[PDB]
């Protein structure tokens, strides 16, 4: 768990060197993008349940997975699916605020593949659900904030696949 | 079911089944024939139950079928009839099993979270199960209507 600042400090410390001009430039880049990160995080905190339910309405609804035999069939499985998608959106917001995806592979992508493979959860359908969540939130917060959200959404989909 | 519940309740207590629980399982085993008769009554006439209950529901709560209602546009009413069919199927499962752990353990745990994520009024769903209960207990004898209305009662109680 480290943001862009802590990773820059960790690189300069593992070097043992002081903060040179490249580290200063990286921190200036983060300190310019931080206000946009803050406003996108507020806008995403506004519409958590709406983004999640629009992602299910785009991908998972009216397909086979909500029908009998699907892994999203029962009300318990539906509630756990909404819970999993809320987790993905919340941690993508955290990784957007930090500017570093270390929290994603520390706390989402750690044992997620083995959990989903033990439960029988389809990984492709949940990857499509995360992609639709990314599409909806990029329609919500704009072009560049949607892109800096979608880089961590693509990180979650890549670590899941 | 009854046997699962008795086994688990003796299982946490690190004891065998008490004889009172054993005659409970025995009485449920004897009443299984009437349970199967109620299940055939509920299974064979599901078309009229779902149709008449949907009709009485949309008569009672017209706003969900009205513009701006969650169930709007033929498929929204029709889609709702599928959810009502799901709940009648779980009613049949709970009638056979002798307990509400099929109904609760399948379609009542996260029902509030699911129907809040869909944008559905849960009171109108409780009215749908109420009309299903009215049509179903209008279809049977007295003790059969009471035994089926117990599980219908549990579903409407677990809604609100």
């Amino acid at each position: 768990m480290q943001d862009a600042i802590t990773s820059v400090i960790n690189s300069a410390d593992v070097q043992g060197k002081y903060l040179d001009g490249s580290a200063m430039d990286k921190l200036k880049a983060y300190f310019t993008t931080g206000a946009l990160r803050v406003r996108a995080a507020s806008t995403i905190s506004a519409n958590a349940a709406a983004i999640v339910k629009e992602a299910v309405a785009k991908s998972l609804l009216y397909s086979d997975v909500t029908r009998p035999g699907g892994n999203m069939y029962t009300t318990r499985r539906y509630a756990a699916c909404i819970r999993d998608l809320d987790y993905y959106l919340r941690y993508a917001t955290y990784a957007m605020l930090a500017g570093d995806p270390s929290i994603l592979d520390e706390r989402v992508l750690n044992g997620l593949k083995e959990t989903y493979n033990s439960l029988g959860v389809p990984v492709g359908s949940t990857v499509q659900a995360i992609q639709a969540m990314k599409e909806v939130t990029a329609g919500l917060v704009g072009a560049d904030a949607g892109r800096e959200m979608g880089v961590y959404f693509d990180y979650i989909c890549s670590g899941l696949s | 079911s009854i046997v699962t519940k008795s086994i688990v309740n003796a299982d946490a207590e690190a004891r065998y089944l008490s004889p009172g629980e054993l005659d409970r399982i025995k009485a449920f085993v004897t009443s299984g024939e009437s349970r199967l008769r109620i299940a055939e009554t509920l299974t064979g006439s599901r078309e009229r139950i779902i149709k008449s209950a949907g009709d009485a529901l949309f008569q009672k709560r017209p706003d969900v079928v009205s513009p701006g209602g969650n169930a709007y546009g033929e498929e929204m009413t029709a889609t709702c009839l599928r959810d009502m069919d799901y709940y009648l199927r779980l009613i049949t499962y709970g009638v056979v099993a002798g307990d509400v752990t099929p109904i609760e353990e399948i379609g009542l745990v996260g029902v509030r979270e699911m129907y809040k994520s869909l944008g559905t009024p849960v009171d109108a769903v409780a009215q749908a199960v109420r009309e299903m209960k009215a049509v179903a207990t209008g279809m049977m004898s007295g003790d059969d209507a009471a035994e089926a209305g117990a599980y219908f009662d549990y579903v409407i109680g677990a809604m609100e």
């Binding site: 009216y62 086979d64 029908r67 009998p68 069939y73 | 779902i50 149709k51 949907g54 009709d55 949309f58 008569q59 017209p62 079928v65 033929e74 498929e75 929204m76 009413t77 029709a78 889609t79 709702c80 009839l81 599928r82 069919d85 799901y86």
Partner: peptide, 27 residues
């Protein structure tokens, strides 16, 4: 003919599209 896609079958159990006729029939 060897269709490369899923067969033309429809109205699987627990589908809302099967209950769309009965949705039309009710008020």
């Amino acid at each position: 003919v060897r269709r490369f896609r899923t067969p033309d079958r429809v109205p699987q159990a627990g589908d809302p599209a099967l209950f769309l006729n009965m949705a039309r029939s009710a008020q």
